[PDB]
Ligand binder design. Structure first.
Ligand SMILES: *C[C@@H](NCc1c(COP(=O)(O)O)cnc(C)c1O)C(=O)O
Ligand SMILES: *C[C@@H](NCc1c(COP(=O)(O)O)cnc(C)c1O)C(=O)O
Ligand SMILES: [Mg+2]
Ligand SMILES: [Mg+2]
Lengths: 319, 319
C-alpha cells in the first residue's frame, strides 16, 4: 500500500486553492482563561458545503482525467462527503451518483440532491454500503471516490490543519474528529511536517470506538454500526490507508459521550456564536475532558462541520 | 451640538486596536446566487463580548482621565452595551454600575455581573431609565457613558464598518441595525468616507419604527417601548447626536417583522453556520426583502451581535 506523504497535502492545497475557503481561526477568552492556555479553532464549518470534506472531494476529482470525469463518479457517504462530491462534481461537470444512509440529516440529503447528485439510500445499521458501491460502480462503469480510505481524499483533508499551522505556528496538541480516519490521517501528515513534536489526538464517540481499539490492538477492529448522535463518525472500522498513517503518526485516540457532545454544541453556540454539528464537537469535547493536561500550552481544535437539521439542532440546544 | 466626524472613527480604531477583535468577513454562495450579487457579512457576533458594542465602550472609557476612571462610570443598556462597558471597565480598572431592563436576556445580565458590573434593573416598558441614570450618577458622582447618544460611543461603533470597507472596498449598499442610532450613525460616517456614494440603510423592527418616523418627519419621534423580539432595538426614540448624523448621511430606514427576523435567524444558523441574536437579524432581513434592488451589486451586511439565551434561541429555531 503506497501511502501519501506531506507532499500530497501540499499539492492538494494548490488543486483546491481556486474554490475552497481559507476558513478563519477563532479564539476565545473564556476558553483560554478556563484552560489556562491558547486555544485555536479551525472552522471548517465555514468551508464550502459546511464541512472539511470539500477539500478531499475536490483534490480527488481534480485528478481525474477527461475520460474518468465524463464517465462519472460514485461514492458512499454519511452526508458531508456526499455534499462535497456533489458540489465538486457540478463544478467540474462530472456526473455523480451518491449512496447515503436513510437516517442521514435531511439537510445533507437535500444539499446533495440540490448540487445535482443522484442519491440512492442504504440502511446504515444493516447494509454493506461498500459492497453496494463496488457492485453499482462495476455494473455502471463509475469511478469510486471513497469518503476517506483514498490517498487523494485524505491528503486533501489535511489541508485544513496545514492552514492552521501556517496561520498560528506549531502547537502543543491537535484534537481531530475521527470517523473513517481521512481527516485524522491527513491532519497527522500536516502536523508531523509543521510541528513534528505536536501531540495528535483522534476523538471518537464512545459507542463507536473501533478506531481507539484498532490503535491499541495494532490491527483494524470491526464493530456493528454504533448508535450515537455523531452521525459523521458511525463508521464500523478505519480505512486501510488511514490506519497505516494513524498507526505511525497519531499519539492517542480518545472518546466522549453524546452527553459531552451536546454540552459542547451548546458551548459553541452560546460562547463562540457558531453552529457545530454533533460530530464536529468531538475534538473540543475531548480537549475539555483533559484540560488539566493542556495547562500553559497551545492547543489546536478542528471544527469539522456544521451541517445539522435545524429542528434537530434546536432540540439539542434545548437539553 | 458638536458632531463627531470620520476623524473620530479613525482615532477610535487606534484606541481599541489593543483589545478588540478584527472580526472576519463572511460570504455565502447561496446568498450571492440568490441575490445575484456579492454580499459581505461583517461578523460583530464574533467581537469581544459577542457584539459590536465593545468598540464604543472601550473607545469612550479609554478617553476618561485618571480621576474619572477612579470615580467610576454608570450606564443604562438593554444588555450588550452593559456587557461591553463591564468588560472594558474591568480591563481599565474602572468601577462600573449598570442599569438593565428586567426582561433582558439572562445571558446578558449574567455576563455583565461576571465581568464585574454592578447591576440595577428597570422596567423596560414603563420606567424612565435615563432619569434613573441621571439621578443615580448625580447622587453618586459617576460619569455616564450612554449606550449610543455620545460622540465617543458612536464613533467607536463606526470602526466595524471601517474594517469592512478596508477589507472589501466600496459597496453599493450597507444595511445596519437600528436602535438608538449609535451603530448606524458611526457606520454612516465610515461609509461617507470610504464610499461616499454607498446607500446607507438603517433597519428597525416594525413595531419600533420611531427612527423611520423621525427620518421622514425631520425631527425625533417618540413612541412607547415597542414589543418585539429584537430586544436590542426597543428604544423609544433616537439620540440627538445620532439623529443629527443619520439625518444627513443615511439614505433610508426600513422595517421588518419579527417573523422575518426568525426566518433570518434560521438562515444564519442553517446556511452560514453562525448564531445571531434577533436584533442582529434586522439588516439582512431587510436586504432579503429588497433583493430585486440589489441585483448585480455589492452589498454589506452588519451582523451586530449573537447574544441570546440558548433556550430562547432553540425556541426561535423551532418555529
Ligand atoms: C467521510 C464522512 N465524514 C465524516 C465526518 C468526520 C470524520 O471524518 P473521517 O471519516 O474520519 O474522515 C468528522 N466531522 C464531520 C462533520 C464529518 O462529516 C462522510 O461524510 O461520508
Ligand atoms: C446600545 C444598545 N444596543 C443595541 C443593539 C443594536 C442597535 O444599536 P443602536 O442602539 O442603534 O446603537 C443592534 N444590534 C445589537 C445586537 C444590539 O445590542 C445596548 O445594548 O444598550
Ligand atoms: Mg469509530
Ligand atoms: Mg426604533
Amino acid at each position: 500500500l503506497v501511502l501519501p506523504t506531506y507532499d500530497d497535502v501540499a499539492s492538494a492545497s494548490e488543486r483546491i486553492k481556486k474554490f475552497a475557503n481559507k476558513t478563519p481561526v477563532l479564539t476565545s477568552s473564556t476558553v483560554n482563561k478556563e484552560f489556562v492556555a491558547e486555544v485555536f479553532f479551525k472552522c471548517e464549518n465555514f468551508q464550502k458545503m459546511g464541512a472539511f470534506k470539500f477539500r478531499g472531494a475536490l483534490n480527488a476529482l481534480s485528478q481525474l482525467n477527461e475520460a474518468q470525469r465524463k464517465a462519472g463518479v460514485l461514492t458512499f457517504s454519511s452526508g458531508n462527503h456526499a455534499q462535497a462530491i456533489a458540489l465538486s462534481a457540478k463544478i467540474l461537470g462530472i456526473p455523480a451518483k451518491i449512496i447515503m444512509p436513510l437516517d442521514a440529516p435531511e439537510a445533507k440529503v437535500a444539499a446533495t440532491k440540490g448540487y445535482g447528485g443522484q442519491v440512492i439510500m442504504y440502511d446504515r445499521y444493516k447494509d454493506d454500503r461498500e459492497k453496494m458501491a463496488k457492485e453499482i460502480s462495476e455494473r455502471e462503469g463509475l469511478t469510486i471516490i471513497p469518503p476517506y480510505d483514498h490517498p487523494h481524499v485524505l491528503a486533501g483533508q489535511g489541508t485544513a490543519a496545514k492552514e492552521l499551522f501556517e496561520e498560528v505556528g506549531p502547537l502543543d496538541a491537535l484534537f481531530v474528529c475521527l470517523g473513517g480516519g481521512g481527516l485524522l490521517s491527513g491532519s497527522a501528515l500536516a502536523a508531523r511536517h509543521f510541528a513534528p513534536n505536536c501531540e495528535v489526538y483522534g476523538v471518537e464517540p464512545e459507542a463507536g470506538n473501533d478506531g481507539q481499539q484498532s490503535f491499541r490492538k495494532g490491527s483494524i477492529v470491526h464493530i456493528d454500526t454504533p448508535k450515537t448522535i455523531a452521525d459523521g463518525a458511525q463508521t464500523q472500522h478505519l480505512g486501510n490507508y488511514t490506519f497505516s498513517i494513524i498507526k505511525e503518526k497519531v499519539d492517542d485516540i480518545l472518546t466522549v459521550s453524546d452527553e459531552e457532545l451536546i454540552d459542547c454544541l451548546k458551548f459553541y453556540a452560546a460562547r463562540m456564536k457558531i453552529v457545530v454539528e454533533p460530530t464536529g464537537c468531538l475534538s473540543f469535547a475531548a480537549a475539555r475532558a483533559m484540560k488539566e493536561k493542556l495547562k500553559n500550552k497551545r492547543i489546536g481544535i478542528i471544527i469539522s462541520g456544521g451541517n445539522v437539521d435545524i429542528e434537530r439542532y434546536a432540540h439539542f440546544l434545548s437539553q
